[PDB]
Amino acid sequence: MDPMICLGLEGTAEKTGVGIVTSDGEVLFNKTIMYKPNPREAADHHAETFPKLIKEAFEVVDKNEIDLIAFSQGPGLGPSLRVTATVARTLSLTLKKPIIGVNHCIAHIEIGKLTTEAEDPLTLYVSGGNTQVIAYVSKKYRVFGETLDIAVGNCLDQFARYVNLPHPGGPYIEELARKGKKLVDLPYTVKGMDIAFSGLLTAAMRAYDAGERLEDICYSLQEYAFSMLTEITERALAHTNKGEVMLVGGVAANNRLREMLKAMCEGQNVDFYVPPKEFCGDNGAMIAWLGLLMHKNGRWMSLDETKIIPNYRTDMVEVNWIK
Amino acid sequence: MDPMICLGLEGTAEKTGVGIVTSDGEVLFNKTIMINPREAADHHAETFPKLIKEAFEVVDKNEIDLIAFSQGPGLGPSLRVTATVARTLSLTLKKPIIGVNHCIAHIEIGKLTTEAEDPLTLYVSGGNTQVIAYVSKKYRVFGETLDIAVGNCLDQFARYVNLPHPGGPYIEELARKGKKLVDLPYTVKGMDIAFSGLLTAAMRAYDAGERLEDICYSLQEYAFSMLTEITERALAHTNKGEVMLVGGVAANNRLREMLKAMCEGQNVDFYVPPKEFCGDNGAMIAWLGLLMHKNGRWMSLDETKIIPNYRTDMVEVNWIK
Amino acid sequence: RVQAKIEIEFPSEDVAKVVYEAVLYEHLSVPYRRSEIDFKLEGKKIILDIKATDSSALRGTVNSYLRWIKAAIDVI
Amino acid sequence: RVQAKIEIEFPSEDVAKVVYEAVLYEHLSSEIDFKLEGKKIILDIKATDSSALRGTVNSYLRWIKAAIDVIE
Amino acid sequence: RVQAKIEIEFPSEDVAKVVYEAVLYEHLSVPYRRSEIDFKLEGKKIILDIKATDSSALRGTVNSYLRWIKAAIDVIEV
Amino acid sequence: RVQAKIEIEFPSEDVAKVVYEAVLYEHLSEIDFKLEGKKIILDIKATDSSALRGTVNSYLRWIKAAIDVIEV
Ligand SMILES: Nc1ncnc2c1ncn2[C@@H]1O[C@H](COP(=O)(O)O)[C@@H](O)[C@H]1O
Ligand SMILES: Nc1ncnc2c1ncn2[C@@H]1O[C@H](COP(=O)(O)O)[C@@H](O)[C@H]1O
Ligand SMILES: [Mg+2]
Ligand SMILES: [Mg+2]
């Protein structure tokens, strides 16, 4: 009669995360630690942080009442995913509790549907390493439009460390963007529902070498990138006939991107949802919830099914929790 | 550290059983409670809750990590009650569930509590009569009964001469006083036996007027000799060094006598489990479920449907090498 | 010819699902039926829509399902 | 709460009456409502638990079967 | 060539099994290896027998495996 | 505790001496660092695995640097 409690482990990127949620929407514990600067070093960070986060998690909830252990199985970096996986089944063998392999990208979507009014949304995944448009169509979560080359989150980081800005350059670019107030000539690259930021980036830093003011470039880089994002979202929204639009990922913290997308949504008579700040970026809570979502609806996997999947495709899952 | 604790549920045929064993050989709890298949299922539905309640008094329900149940082979309606009860606990206690083969559970509980390592097992039950050995990476049936089982044959004969339903023991007692064999058919074909032909002639001798005690002696002589024969032949087919006697009929002293004599003659060992572990019990199901799961087998609920005709080679042995 | 509707309400919604899922796999473990059966879960109650040929066919199916459901409840 | 509603249709309205009267009168002792509507016999049963419901259903379905078996 | 043999002893035999089993699946999750490795369990200790081409190749696999083992042990305790 | 033994073969025994002397003299857990013929033996004993990994990384880094000078 008591609700089942799951322990989630997030360790695909730079962020190490541990989460604890129940069968219901309640999140008992959630904490994530970042890494301030390399895949080998990032993996070492997970190996150091994960044991520490678990101590704090086991102080909130006693280890015996943990019924399920979920972990981000992928997609992500090789060495990073291995630490997460190893820690996940280490706990599974110790506590003598089941283990569940969880897709990272869907965990972002499902934690939004739990913390937002989204029922069947078209999700725009905008991360430091991801840029995809995911919707649930034909009994599977599918990517209708996604990025060629790199992600926009990666594009903002790579531009930041080029102009001598702190590593999480995303937020810092947004601040500088307000003071700019002059559009720079940049390439607008959209193909169908797919985008490319490689052409936009190289031209953006060339304009920096040209001597055009950095404030203007930050303003221009955002306007172009987010417009291209808004367009492919609009096309996919019409292609899937959904009634909602979700914005997940770390770049969801961008005020301008929210503004642009919410405006587009108000135009086509659809709703626009963004999760709480704690659940937008990488976190252990979303992995716990999706692991709980799959297992409660009847998915069991043995240890030999828990090997890492660095290139986990969205349509490789089997959605058993959607009515 | 601490060992994993499993709750076993035995509900094949007439006997209801609940067992609790650890990762090690230690047995924490084991109790069994004593025809129409439809009525037998009702018996399980009434008995199982009482025994499980009783089991939770010895071991706290929170300390149960695994739930194993006899998935088959056996009677239809009986197996369904066991399975439903098994996964009801699995959903309640929020612990994994494992489907266990009945016939192999008899063997594995036998390798435990005895010095048997890789034996040729003679399964002699009320509904089963098989010779099972572990050969070529699977547990295989080399010889088995045609028609009915010998355990059933003694029951059908007992309730024919107006004896109580668990006829096995009562025939053995009467067999001692008889001491003269009546001419009965000795039916063995290859590695298989048939008791249907033996039975009809046994009851024919009863109508003829020969003493039931004398008949019991003769019925035992013929039936147990036929069982002993295919066991010896199977022993040569598998090249094993041990012989095991499991099942409810393993309680028979005469059968034990013939086989140990055969084993001492062919220079092989002979093992029989403790009286509590020979017949149907919840302990053997707990151990094999533990055996499979500890070696890394997880199964979801859709893999826990009943298997009334579960073949021995349909399992996948991940616990022996 | 012969129709029946059995409803079993439970104290909480959580208990209803638990009993339902345990029985469900036995509802799908039936190759040959004495009667057509609909076994669904609506909120805190378990619905049983049975349609049979004769009274004897309905009796067999009700005894079977109610045995499973009873066994499930008796465990909790 | 455990509830049940069983309906048994008959060839003629008279046949329904014969069976209805036969079962009602030859078996006098959970809450039960046993009525006859046209060509069909309705049986509304309300019990405390499943075992009690199973017991009363078994009883009535036995009686109804026995009643028909006499006619045929 | 460059060869190495690493041994990691544990307090209990059961603890050794847990770490070993957890790491084992990462030992089989390697499609392309920079050096040949044998990852076995003997009693209370985990044996790690590595044979590589050069020193840099040995360092990569030792770092990887010892990382996994470190992560496994750190979890069991506390 | 946690122990390790690394062996590194070299083309010539003379080359082994050069590398061995280069690491030993330019760099001043329990460690045994000896030279046997054309091979360099490294017997390391640490408290924990993380401690062993740190010291192994150090020596393999130094040996790598020594060889890189010799080879072209
Ligand atoms: N306000 C922002 N504007 C633009 N990019 C951002 C902002 N906040 C975070 N990011 C980027 O989001 C990424 C982190 O996403 P994640 O790894 O999913 O948490 C990094 O590339 C950041 O630079
Ligand atoms: N001492 C005995 N001698 C012969 N048969 C027995 C004895 N005890 C039990 N049986 C038979 O074993 C069967 C029940 O045991 P089981 O097969 O374990 O359920 C029935 O066929 C009994 O007649
Ligand atoms: Mg992410
Ligand atoms: Mg048996």
mmCIF file with all atom_site columns, N, CA, C and O in Angstrom, chain B residues 82-108:
data_model
loop_
_atom_site.group_PDB
_atom_site.id
_atom_site.type_symbol
_atom_site.label_atom_id
_atom_site.label_alt_id
_atom_site.label_comp_id
_atom_site.label_asym_id
_atom_site.label_entity_id
_atom_site.label_seq_id
_atom_site.pdbx_PDB_ins_code
_atom_site.Cartn_x
_atom_site.Cartn_y
_atom_site.Cartn_z
_atom_site.occupancy
_atom_site.B_iso_or_equiv
_atom_site.pdbx_formal_charge
_atom_site.auth_seq_id
_atom_site.auth_comp_id
_atom_site.auth_asym_id
_atom_site.auth_atom_id
_atom_site.pdbx_PDB_model_num
ATOM 1   N N  . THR B 1 82  ? -1.040 -20.873 -6.812  1.00 0.00 ? 82  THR B N  1
ATOM 2   C CA . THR B 1 82  ? 0.340  -20.679 -6.380  1.00 0.00 ? 82  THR B CA 1
ATOM 3   C C  . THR B 1 82  ? 0.979  -19.465 -7.046  1.00 0.00 ? 82  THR B C  1
ATOM 4   O O  . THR B 1 82  ? 1.586  -18.630 -6.377  1.00 0.00 ? 82  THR B O  1
ATOM 5   N N  . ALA B 1 83  ? 0.839  -19.379 -8.365  1.00 0.00 ? 83  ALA B N  1
ATOM 6   C CA . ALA B 1 83  ? 1.411  -18.279 -9.134  1.00 0.00 ? 83  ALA B CA 1
ATOM 7   C C  . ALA B 1 83  ? 0.821  -16.932 -8.725  1.00 0.00 ? 83  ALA B C  1
ATOM 8   O O  . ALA B 1 83  ? 1.556  -15.978 -8.477  1.00 0.00 ? 83  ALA B O  1
ATOM 9   N N  . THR B 1 84  ? -0.506 -16.866 -8.652  1.00 0.00 ? 84  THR B N  1
ATOM 10  C CA . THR B 1 84  ? -1.200 -15.633 -8.291  1.00 0.00 ? 84  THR B CA 1
ATOM 11  C C  . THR B 1 84  ? -0.781 -15.151 -6.906  1.00 0.00 ? 84  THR B C  1
ATOM 12  O O  . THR B 1 84  ? -0.515 -13.966 -6.705  1.00 0.00 ? 84  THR B O  1
ATOM 13  N N  . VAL B 1 85  ? -0.722 -16.080 -5.958  1.00 0.00 ? 85  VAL B N  1
ATOM 14  C CA . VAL B 1 85  ? -0.275 -15.777 -4.605  1.00 0.00 ? 85  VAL B CA 1
ATOM 15  C C  . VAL B 1 85  ? 1.183  -15.318 -4.619  1.00 0.00 ? 85  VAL B C  1
ATOM 16  O O  . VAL B 1 85  ? 1.561  -14.391 -3.898  1.00 0.00 ? 85  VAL B O  1
ATOM 17  N N  . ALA B 1 86  ? 1.991  -15.963 -5.455  1.00 0.00 ? 86  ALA B N  1
ATOM 18  C CA . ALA B 1 86  ? 3.414  -15.650 -5.558  1.00 0.00 ? 86  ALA B CA 1
ATOM 19  C C  . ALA B 1 86  ? 3.676  -14.212 -6.002  1.00 0.00 ? 86  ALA B C  1
ATOM 20  O O  . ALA B 1 86  ? 4.488  -13.513 -5.397  1.00 0.00 ? 86  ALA B O  1
ATOM 21  N N  . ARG B 1 87  ? 2.994  -13.768 -7.054  1.00 0.00 ? 87  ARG B N  1
ATOM 22  C CA . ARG B 1 87  ? 3.228  -12.423 -7.571  1.00 0.00 ? 87  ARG B CA 1
ATOM 23  C C  . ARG B 1 87  ? 2.435  -11.370 -6.805  1.00 0.00 ? 87  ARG B C  1
ATOM 24  O O  . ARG B 1 87  ? 2.731  -10.177 -6.891  1.00 0.00 ? 87  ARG B O  1
ATOM 25  N N  . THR B 1 88  ? 1.426  -11.809 -6.060  1.00 0.00 ? 88  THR B N  1
ATOM 26  C CA . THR B 1 88  ? 0.714  -10.912 -5.159  1.00 0.00 ? 88  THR B CA 1
ATOM 27  C C  . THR B 1 88  ? 1.690  -10.427 -4.095  1.00 0.00 ? 88  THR B C  1
ATOM 28  O O  . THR B 1 88  ? 1.733  -9.242  -3.765  1.00 0.00 ? 88  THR B O  1
ATOM 29  N N  . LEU B 1 89  ? 2.475  -11.360 -3.567  1.00 0.00 ? 89  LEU B N  1
ATOM 30  C CA . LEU B 1 89  ? 3.544  -11.037 -2.631  1.00 0.00 ? 89  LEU B CA 1
ATOM 31  C C  . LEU B 1 89  ? 4.610  -10.181 -3.308  1.00 0.00 ? 89  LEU B C  1
ATOM 32  O O  . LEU B 1 89  ? 5.136  -9.241  -2.711  1.00 0.00 ? 89  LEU B O  1
ATOM 33  N N  . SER B 1 90  ? 4.928  -10.521 -4.555  1.00 0.00 ? 90  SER B N  1
ATOM 34  C CA . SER B 1 90  ? 5.959  -9.818  -5.313  1.00 0.00 ? 90  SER B CA 1
ATOM 35  C C  . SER B 1 90  ? 5.604  -8.350  -5.508  1.00 0.00 ? 90  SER B C  1
ATOM 36  O O  . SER B 1 90  ? 6.474  -7.479  -5.464  1.00 0.00 ? 90  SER B O  1
ATOM 37  N N  . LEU B 1 91  ? 4.322  -8.083  -5.728  1.00 0.00 ? 91  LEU B N  1
ATOM 38  C CA . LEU B 1 91  ? 3.844  -6.719  -5.902  1.00 0.00 ? 91  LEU B CA 1
ATOM 39  C C  . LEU B 1 91  ? 3.725  -6.008  -4.555  1.00 0.00 ? 91  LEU B C  1
ATOM 40  O O  . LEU B 1 91  ? 3.951  -4.802  -4.453  1.00 0.00 ? 91  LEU B O  1
ATOM 41  N N  . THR B 1 92  ? 3.367  -6.769  -3.525  1.00 0.00 ? 92  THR B N  1
ATOM 42  C CA . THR B 1 92  ? 3.190  -6.225  -2.183  1.00 0.00 ? 92  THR B CA 1
ATOM 43  C C  . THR B 1 92  ? 4.525  -5.909  -1.517  1.00 0.00 ? 92  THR B C  1
ATOM 44  O O  . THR B 1 92  ? 4.775  -4.774  -1.110  1.00 0.00 ? 92  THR B O  1
ATOM 45  N N  . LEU B 1 93  ? 5.381  -6.922  -1.413  1.00 0.00 ? 93  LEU B N  1
ATOM 46  C CA . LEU B 1 93  ? 6.682  -6.774  -0.767  1.00 0.00 ? 93  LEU B CA 1
ATOM 47  C C  . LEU B 1 93  ? 7.655  -5.985  -1.638  1.00 0.00 ? 93  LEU B C  1
ATOM 48  O O  . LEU B 1 93  ? 8.747  -5.628  -1.191  1.00 0.00 ? 93  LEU B O  1
ATOM 49  N N  . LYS B 1 94  ? 7.244  -5.725  -2.878  1.00 0.00 ? 94  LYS B N  1
ATOM 50  C CA . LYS B 1 94  ? 8.049  -4.995  -3.856  1.00 0.00 ? 94  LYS B CA 1
ATOM 51  C C  . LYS B 1 94  ? 9.402  -5.670  -4.045  1.00 0.00 ? 94  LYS B C  1
ATOM 52  O O  . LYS B 1 94  ? 10.448 -5.023  -4.009  1.00 0.00 ? 94  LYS B O  1
ATOM 53  N N  . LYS B 1 95  ? 9.362  -6.982  -4.246  1.00 0.00 ? 95  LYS B N  1
ATOM 54  C CA . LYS B 1 95  ? 10.565 -7.780  -4.430  1.00 0.00 ? 95  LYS B CA 1
ATOM 55  C C  . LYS B 1 95  ? 10.446 -8.618  -5.701  1.00 0.00 ? 95  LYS B C  1
ATOM 56  O O  . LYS B 1 95  ? 9.337  -8.887  -6.162  1.00 0.00 ? 95  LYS B O  1
ATOM 57  N N  . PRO B 1 96  ? 11.589 -9.024  -6.280  1.00 0.00 ? 96  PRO B N  1
ATOM 58  C CA . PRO B 1 96  ? 11.564 -9.808  -7.521  1.00 0.00 ? 96  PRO B CA 1
ATOM 59  C C  . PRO B 1 96  ? 10.895 -11.173 -7.363  1.00 0.00 ? 96  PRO B C  1
ATOM 60  O O  . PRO B 1 96  ? 10.783 -11.688 -6.250  1.00 0.00 ? 96  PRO B O  1
ATOM 61  N N  . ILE B 1 97  ? 10.464 -11.749 -8.482  1.00 0.00 ? 97  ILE B N  1
ATOM 62  C CA . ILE B 1 97  ? 9.805  -13.051 -8.482  1.00 0.00 ? 97  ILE B CA 1
ATOM 63  C C  . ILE B 1 97  ? 10.504 -13.987 -9.465  1.00 0.00 ? 97  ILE B C  1
ATOM 64  O O  . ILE B 1 97  ? 11.014 -13.546 -10.495 1.00 0.00 ? 97  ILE B O  1
ATOM 65  N N  . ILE B 1 98  ? 10.546 -15.275 -9.135  1.00 0.00 ? 98  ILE B N  1
ATOM 66  C CA . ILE B 1 98  ? 11.209 -16.258 -9.984  1.00 0.00 ? 98  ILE B CA 1
ATOM 67  C C  . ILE B 1 98  ? 10.363 -17.515 -10.184 1.00 0.00 ? 98  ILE B C  1
ATOM 68  O O  . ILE B 1 98  ? 9.872  -18.106 -9.221  1.00 0.00 ? 98  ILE B O  1
ATOM 69  N N  . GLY B 1 99  ? 10.197 -17.915 -11.442 1.00 0.00 ? 99  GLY B N  1
ATOM 70  C CA . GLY B 1 99  ? 9.486  -19.135 -11.778 1.00 0.00 ? 99  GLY B CA 1
ATOM 71  C C  . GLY B 1 99  ? 10.408 -20.336 -11.697 1.00 0.00 ? 99  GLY B C  1
ATOM 72  O O  . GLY B 1 99  ? 11.476 -20.352 -12.308 1.00 0.00 ? 99  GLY B O  1
ATOM 73  N N  . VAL B 1 100 ? 9.992  -21.344 -10.938 1.00 0.00 ? 100 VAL B N  1
ATOM 74  C CA . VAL B 1 100 ? 10.847 -22.489 -10.637 1.00 0.00 ? 100 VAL B CA 1
ATOM 75  C C  . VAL B 1 100 ? 10.250 -23.800 -11.144 1.00 0.00 ? 100 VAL B C  1
ATOM 76  O O  . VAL B 1 100 ? 9.068  -24.076 -10.931 1.00 0.00 ? 100 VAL B O  1
ATOM 77  N N  . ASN B 1 101 ? 11.069 -24.610 -11.808 1.00 0.00 ? 101 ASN B N  1
ATOM 78  C CA . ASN B 1 101 ? 10.632 -25.931 -12.241 1.00 0.00 ? 101 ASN B CA 1
ATOM 79  C C  . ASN B 1 101 ? 10.556 -26.886 -11.054 1.00 0.00 ? 101 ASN B C  1
ATOM 80  O O  . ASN B 1 101 ? 11.498 -26.991 -10.268 1.00 0.00 ? 101 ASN B O  1
ATOM 81  N N  . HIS B 1 102 ? 9.424  -27.570 -10.932 1.00 0.00 ? 102 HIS B N  1
ATOM 82  C CA . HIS B 1 102 ? 9.163  -28.455 -9.802  1.00 0.00 ? 102 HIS B CA 1
ATOM 83  C C  . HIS B 1 102 ? 10.141 -29.625 -9.727  1.00 0.00 ? 102 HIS B C  1
ATOM 84  O O  . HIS B 1 102 ? 10.719 -29.892 -8.674  1.00 0.00 ? 102 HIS B O  1
ATOM 85  N N  . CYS B 1 103 ? 10.321 -30.316 -10.849 1.00 0.00 ? 103 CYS B N  1
ATOM 86  C CA . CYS B 1 103 ? 11.125 -31.535 -10.885 1.00 0.00 ? 103 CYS B CA 1
ATOM 87  C C  . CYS B 1 103 ? 12.599 -31.285 -10.569 1.00 0.00 ? 103 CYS B C  1
ATOM 88  O O  . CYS B 1 103 ? 13.248 -32.103 -9.916  1.00 0.00 ? 103 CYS B O  1
ATOM 89  N N  . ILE B 1 104 ? 13.121 -30.155 -11.031 1.00 0.00 ? 104 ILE B N  1
ATOM 90  C CA . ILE B 1 104 ? 14.517 -29.806 -10.790 1.00 0.00 ? 104 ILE B CA 1
ATOM 91  C C  . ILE B 1 104 ? 14.730 -29.366 -9.342  1.00 0.00 ? 104 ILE B C  1
ATOM 92  O O  . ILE B 1 104 ? 15.791 -29.601 -8.761  1.00 0.00 ? 104 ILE B O  1
ATOM 93  N N  . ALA B 1 105 ? 13.712 -28.737 -8.764  1.00 0.00 ? 105 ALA B N  1
ATOM 94  C CA . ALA B 1 105 ? 13.762 -28.313 -7.368  1.00 0.00 ? 105 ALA B CA 1
ATOM 95  C C  . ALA B 1 105 ? 13.964 -29.516 -6.450  1.00 0.00 ? 105 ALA B C  1
ATOM 96  O O  . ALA B 1 105 ? 14.616 -29.415 -5.411  1.00 0.00 ? 105 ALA B O  1
ATOM 97  N N  . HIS B 1 106 ? 13.396 -30.652 -6.843  1.00 0.00 ? 106 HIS B N  1
ATOM 98  C CA . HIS B 1 106 ? 13.573 -31.897 -6.107  1.00 0.00 ? 106 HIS B CA 1
ATOM 99  C C  . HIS B 1 106 ? 15.031 -32.345 -6.148  1.00 0.00 ? 106 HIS B C  1
ATOM 100 O O  . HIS B 1 106 ? 15.561 -32.859 -5.164  1.00 0.00 ? 106 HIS B O  1
ATOM 101 N N  . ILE B 1 107 ? 15.670 -32.154 -7.298  1.00 0.00 ? 107 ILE B N  1
ATOM 102 C CA . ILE B 1 107 ? 17.057 -32.566 -7.488  1.00 0.00 ? 107 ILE B CA 1
ATOM 103 C C  . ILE B 1 107 ? 18.031 -31.649 -6.753  1.00 0.00 ? 107 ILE B C  1
ATOM 104 O O  . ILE B 1 107 ? 18.957 -32.120 -6.093  1.00 0.00 ? 107 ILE B O  1
ATOM 105 N N  . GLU B 1 108 ? 17.817 -30.341 -6.870  1.00 0.00 ? 108 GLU B N  1
ATOM 106 C CA . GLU B 1 108 ? 18.734 -29.357 -6.299  1.00 0.00 ? 108 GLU B CA 1
ATOM 107 C C  . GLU B 1 108 ? 18.680 -29.315 -4.775  1.00 0.00 ? 108 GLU B C  1
ATOM 108 O O  . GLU B 1 108 ? 19.689 -29.042 -4.122  1.00 0.00 ? 108 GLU B O  1
#
